[PDB]
Design a protein around this ligand. Structure first.
Ligand SMILES: O=P(O)(O)OC[C@H]1O[C@@H](OP(=O)(O)O)[C@H](O)[C@@H](O)[C@@H]1O
Ligand SMILES: [Mg+2]
Length: 218
């Protein structure tokens, strides 16, 4: 029996991807870079703020000082934060609040393994903070997804190994991160996007305690 569930935020608990996309595209336009389109943005799922900026600069082979790099990330983040000011418990994806309740009632540990430094703010606005035993801080890990680091940190933060855990994710990078951490992935989306070798649910309402348990068995 698994002892913990490690949650991606964007794409599982809710999804603010549209707002991240709008903010990055607006930044890119401001600094003269073309090619920040929806296809390009798909690649930024699960990827750190700093890595995402670097990918965007790479499109135009643009060079910036370390200090300009910081200013640009801040500018985009300030814009993204403005865009998520109305997030509320209404934004929680279907099945998620009940899963958290059930996990908690059954003494299963709950950890956030999000690349977003806006993670704690979002969980607060959704009234979910109380379910989380720990939040892996993305500013303390060495790498973006698909590195396993964030999942390894989330599991260790609640006193268990990743191999004793289930990771829920919506992105390729995140699925790969879970795999490489040693945790059991259950993807949400399409087997085309996330793999044939793993259990995939079509949407978050299929994330139930009884479904997790049954998958932890096969
Ligand atoms: O630190 P921030 O600027 O708030 O966000 C960093 C990243 O968080 C990720 O969240 P997740 O891992 O899916 O929950 C997003 O998928 C990604 O597009 C974003 O760039
Ligand atoms: Mg995600």
């Amino acid at each position: 029996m698994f002892k913990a569930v490690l949650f991606d935020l964007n794409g599982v608990i809710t999804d603010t991807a549209e707002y991240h996309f709008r903010a990055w595209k607006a930044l890119a336009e401001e600094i003269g870079i073309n090619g920040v389109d929806r296809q390009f943005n798909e690649q930024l799922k699960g990827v750190s703020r700093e890595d995402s900026l670097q990918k965007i600069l790479d499109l135009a082979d643009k060079k910036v000082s370390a200090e300009e790099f910081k200013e640009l990330a801040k500018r985009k983040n300030d814009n993204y934060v403005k865009m998520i000011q109305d997030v509320s418990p209404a934004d929680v994806y279907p099945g998620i609040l009940q899963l958290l309740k059930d996990l908690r009632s059954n003494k299963i540990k709950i950890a956030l393994a999000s690349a977003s430094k806006n993670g704690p703010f979002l969980l607060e606005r959704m009234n979910l903070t109380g379910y989380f035993d720990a939040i892996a801080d993305p500013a303390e890990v060495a790498a973006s997804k698909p590195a396993p680091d964030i999942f390894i940190a989330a599991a260790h933060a609640v006193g268990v190994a990743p191999s004793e855990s289930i990771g829920l994710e919506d992105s390729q990078a995140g699925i790969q991160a879970i795999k490489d951490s040693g945790a059991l992935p259950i993807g949400v989306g399409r087997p085309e996007d996330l793999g044939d070798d793993i259990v995939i649910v079509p949407d978050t309402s299929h994330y139930t305690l009884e479904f997790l348990k049954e998958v932890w068995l096969q």
